[PDB]
Design a protein around this ligand. Structure first.
Ligand SMILES: OC[C@H]1O[C@@H](O[C@H]2[C@H](O)[C@@H](O)[C@H](O)O[C@@H]2CO)[C@H](O)[C@@H](O)[C@@H]1O
Ligand SMILES: [Mg+2]
Length: 552
């Protein structure tokens, strides 16, 4: 009821609501090809399988909680200009996620009547929404600091500092100006330069990174869905999984991007776990038994190597030979003590695959809004476009790579931090090269691994990184997965919630007619001009690659 408390709830929901995270585990982080091998991502993204109850969650949960709270608090804060501006900025942020997910969405008519359930809003067009983002963020950025009120509900890294909220608003303007740079290059350039030249500045260093701060509190997964306090980061929670036999595995797309470039992030992101006794309350190092070094030593002894799971395949598909516990001295000692716990062959099978480091799965992980590393990559790309940016593209790109590594050191890694020498060597071996747009946006995709909505939006916009071509990778109908969409390319949006067809029937129909007459998750959004690039060949040294030509 207090508008600062409504700001708090709406900020925390962003990453703190487990009941929308199935959309991120099952679809979006699979679409981006960061993760593959878990059952959930294989069944949904991996099979290009639409299910309304999964696809609808970002829409239903953000409109039911955050948008209702924000709209109510905005109406009730006209006397508190600083809070009012912060509420409106977070509303822009969430509406941009909603529009980048679904396309045309309720916004301009999503007011007091709509959140009370008595009014049907039209769906604003993506083009009109993006235009409004620029005017609203300009207005909010100037309104910040014209109040004397304390933004006491701020749970972000901005810590109620209006100067930091101003830099955040200008950085969002820069992101959205890049987003529209293919469909409207002149507006993109104008808006980008206006924001980057603004007297109040943008996020230029990690000290001004914008993220939501989450607490070290126990995980509860789907339990108590009615009573969510949103205090912990539910993205890392769902990636850890409610089921120890289905943790999140790193895809071959991400694995080979890292390995092929000598990226020191390879075995910071990827670890090998034997996790049968792991805590579900809070990921623990004691029983997420990290056997990475011993697994790599076994590979070296046997002239073999990693088999990261391909997009479309589960860990139990494209079966990788399972080493005996005797191959890993730590596990061998444990199994000689207690075979029921430590000689389980299913848990040893999952030990063979590269797993996401539990450092990315802890309750207190930050919820990234926008980082200085992203802004560095935006400046690098703007320079390559010929926009009026200070400093050469190489300098901005190198700043972005360095800041992406330091982000891991500062926000995630609890051990084995990436050294300055490792960063400098990686940068020296990975310059912009012949296709700077590809290099910049592939590095940004690594940066956005824990910010899946931005990863997916920027990949759709820039069409990089080149993904694995799903149509050239195996399917597994004999394993119970359903392949009901003959177009296997990565979806470019999600379908609208099907209940909208009843609950807001006229406006749902009109939005669907505008995209050509069916609710098509292969239809590109207004700012998405071209198809994402795909890798022309994939023949990994171990495991399975593209199916052999002519065998399909
Ligand atoms: O056990 C079946 C299935 O459950 C999935 O979680 C459900 C959850 O039980 C339900 O309360 C919620 O409303 O929906 C989610 C998503 O369907 C779980 O994610 C799956 O791993 C599991 O196969
Ligand atoms: Mg595209």
């Amino acid at each position: 009821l207090d508008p600062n408390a409504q700001l708090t709830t709406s900020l925390l929901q962003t990453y703190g609501d487990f009941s929308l995270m199935d959309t991120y585990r099952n679809y979006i982080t699979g679409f981006t090809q960061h993760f593959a091998g878990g059952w959930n991502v294989t069944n949904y993204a991996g099979a290009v399988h639409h299910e309304d109850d999964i696809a609808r969650r970002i829409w239903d949960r953000y409109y039911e909680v955050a948008i209702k709270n924000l709209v109510d608090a905005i109406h009730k804060s006209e006397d508190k200009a600083n809070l009012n501006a912060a509420l409106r900025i977070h509303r822009v942020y969430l509406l941009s996620v909603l529009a980048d997910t679904y396309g045309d969405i309720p916004a301009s008519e999503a007011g007091l009547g709509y959140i009370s359930g008595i009014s049907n809003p039209k769906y604003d067009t993506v083009e009109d929404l993006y235009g409004w983002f620029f005017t609203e963020l300009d207005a909010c950025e100037q309104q910040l600091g014209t109040g004397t009120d304390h933004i006491s509900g701020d749970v972000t890294s901005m810590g109620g500092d209006v100067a930091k909220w101003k830099k955040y608003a200008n950085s969002l303007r820069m992101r959205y100006a890049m987003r529209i740079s293919d469909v409207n290059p002149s507006k993109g350039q104008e808006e980008f330069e206006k924001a980057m030249n603004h007297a109040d500045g943008y996020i230029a260093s990690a000290a001004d990174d914008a993220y939501i701060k989450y607490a070290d509190s126990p995980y509860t997964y789907y339990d108590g869905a009615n009573d969510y306090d949103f205090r912990t980061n539910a993205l890392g929670e769902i990636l850890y999984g409610q089921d120890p036999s289905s943790p999140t595995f790193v895809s071959s797309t991400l694995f080979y991007q890292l390995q092929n470039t000598g990226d020191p992030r390879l075995y910071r992101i990827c670890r090998h776990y034997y996790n049968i006794k792991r805590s579900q309350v809070k990921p623990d190092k004691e029983q997420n038994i990290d056997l990475t070094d011993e697994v790599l030593a076994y590979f070296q002894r046997n002239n073999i190597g990693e088999e990261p799971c391909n997009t479309g395949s589960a860990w139990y598909e494209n079966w990788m030979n399972v080493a005996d516990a005797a191959e890993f001295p730590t596990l061998a000692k444990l199994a000689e003590q207690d075979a029921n716990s430590y000689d389980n062959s299913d848990y040893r099978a999952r030990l063979m695959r590269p797993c996401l480091n539990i450092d990315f799965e802890m309750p207190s992980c930050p919820g990234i809004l926008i980082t200085s590393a992203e802004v560095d990559f935006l400046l690098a790309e703007a320079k390559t476009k010929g926009w009026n940016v200070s400093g050469d593209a190489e300098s901005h790109y190198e700043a972005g790579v360095r800041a992406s590594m330091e982000m891991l050191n500062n926000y995630y890694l609890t051990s084995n931090k990436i050294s300055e020498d490792e960063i400098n060597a990686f940068i020296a071996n990975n310059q912009l090269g012949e296709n700077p747009k590809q290099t910049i946006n592939t590095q940004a995709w690594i940066l956005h691994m824990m910010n899946p909505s931005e990863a997916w939006a920027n990949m759709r916009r820039s069409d990089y990184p080149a993904l694995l071509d799903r149509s050239r990778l195996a399917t597994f109908p004999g394993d119970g997965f359903v392949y009901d969409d003959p177009n296997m390319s990565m979806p470019t949006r999600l379908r609208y919630p099907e209940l909208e067809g009843q609950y807001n029937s006229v406006n749902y129909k009109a939005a669907i007619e505008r995209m050509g007459g069916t609710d098509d998750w292969h239809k590109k959004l207004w700012w998405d001009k071209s198809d994402v690039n795909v890798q022309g060949d994939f023949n990994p040294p171990y495991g399975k690659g593209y199916i052999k030509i002519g065998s399909g």
